[PDB]
Amino acid sequence: PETLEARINRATNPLNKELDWASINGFCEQLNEDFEGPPLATRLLAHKIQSPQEWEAIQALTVLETCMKSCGKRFHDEVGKFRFLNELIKVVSPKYLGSRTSEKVKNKILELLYSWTVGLPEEVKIAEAYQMLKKQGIV
User: Fold this and answer.
1) Side-chain-facing half-sphere of 41: CA atoms under 13 Å
2) Rg of the chain over CA atoms, in angstroms?
3) Dihedral pair phi/psi, residue 82, rounded to 5°
4) How far apart are CA 8 and CA 22, in angstroms?
5) Which pairs with CB-CB distance under 8 Å and at least 24 residues apart come from 117-125?
6) Inter-residue contact 32 to 71 (CB < 8 Å)
7) Which domains are assigned to the chain?
8) Which residues sit directly before a break in the chain (C to N > 2.5 Å)?
9) Rounded CA gap, 139 and 133, in Å?
10) Residue ranges of the alpha helices (H) in the chain?
11) How far apart are CA 136 and CA 74, in angstroms?
């Protein structure tokens, strides 16, 4: 076994020639049995998502997507928090570093935010984030 940080580094390594599903899954599963998992994974994911390296960010968006399925309520609540959501907004927003972000990474972020809006009508902060982007014309 290994810690959360090494696990996510391996799952988002810009050298990976292809999605590393064993690392992606292991991270989510590991998170599932870690008493401090969710808040910690959220912080690591934000940082990788903001990466200038596109492959790293895409892989990091794939972990995020996967954990949202596999990790249930405890994880959904943490993703649904202002502090995490505001880090995502930064990547797609002209005001921060959205001008340099690849269309691919941007497209993925808006797709996830939209799916969560529809799929988890209860994480109200996600829908607030989504409407804001819509109101600014980003989506």
Assistant:
1) 34
2) 14
3) -45, -50
4) 11
5) 120/76, 120/80, 123/76, 123/77, 123/79, 123/80, 124/80, 125/80, 125/81, 125/82, 125/85
6) yes
7) 1-139 (1.25.40.90)
8) none
9) 6
10) 4-11, 21-32, 37-49, 54-70, 72-79, 82-92, 103-119, 124-135
11) 30
Q: Any idea which residue has 């269309």 for tokens? A: 103
Measured in angstroms, the resolution is 2.1
Of 132, 13, 121, 100, give the one whose Cα is nearest residue 63.
13
Amino acid (1-letter code) at residue 107: N
Structure-determination technique: X-ray
Residue 98: how many other CB atoms lie within 10 Å: 17
- The residue assigned the tokens 């390296």 is 53
